[PDB]
Amino acid sequence: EFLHAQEEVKRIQSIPLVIGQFLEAVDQNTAIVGSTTGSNYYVRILSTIDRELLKPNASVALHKHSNALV
Amino acid sequence: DKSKLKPGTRVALDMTTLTIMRYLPREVDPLVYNMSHEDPGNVSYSEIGGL
C-alpha cells in the first residue's frame, strides 16, 4: 500500500506545475510563497519527503490542480 | 524531439496538464519582414562616384 500511495504523489510532483519563488518558512507544515500568477499563496509542503531542505530561499513549483507545494 | 524546445521558439502546451502537444513554429513579426523586402532608395546600388 505504501508503494501504491507513493505512485499517486509522484504524478502530482510532476506537471502540471506553476512556478513561484519561495521566500521563507513560517511552519514546517505550511510555508509562504509568491507566484508569477499574481497571487501570494500559503501552500502546504508535501509530507514523507523533505520539508527541511525546503526552507532556504530558492525557486519553487506549486501544483496547478491541488494548489500545494509538492 | 527535445530540440523542439530551445530558448525563444514557440511551443503549444496543453492547458490542463502542461505537457507538450506540439511544436509551434515561431511567429514572424511583419515589421521585420517589411525591413528585409524594402529598399528605401531610388538610387544605384553599384556606385555613386566620389563617394
- Return left, alpha or beta for B37; rule: phi > 0 is left, psi -120 to 50 is alpha, else beta: alpha
| β pairing state of A58-63 and A17-25 | antiparallel
Closest chain A residue to the Cα of B13, Cα to Cα: A16
Q: Within 13 A of B14's CA, how many CA atoms are on the CB side?
A: 9
Query: Does the beta-carbon distance from B17 to A17 stay under 8 Å?
Result: no
Cβ atoms A55, A2 nearer than 8 A: no
Backbone phi and psi for residue A6, each to the nearest 5 degrees, phi listed first? -65, -35
CA distance B19 to chain A (A): 7
With contacts defined as CB-CB under 8 Å, which chain A residues touch B19? Answer: 15
* Distance between CA atoms of residues B49 and A56, nearest Å: 69
Return the beta strands (E) in chain A as ranges: 17-25, 30-35, 40-44, 58-63
Mutate to test the interface with B, among A64, A66, A70 (most CBs of B within 10 A): A64
* Cell digits of residue B21: 502537444
With contacts defined as CB-CB under 8 Å, which chain B residues touch A16? Answer: 16-18
Technique of determination: cryo-EM
Spell out which chain B residues touch chain A, with contact meaning CB-CB distance below 8 angstroms: 16-19
Burial of A50 (0-12, 13-18, 19+ CB in 10 A): exposed
Query: Could you give the 3-state DSSP secondary structure of residue B21?
Result: strand
* Cell digits of residue A54: 525546503
Cβ atoms A42, A27 nearer than 8 A: no
Query: Does the beta-carbon distance from A17 to B18 stay under 8 Å?
Result: yes
What does each C-alpha distance from B23 to A18, A28, B15, B31 come to in angstroms?
21, 41, 15, 24
Resolution in A for the shown PDB structure? 12.8
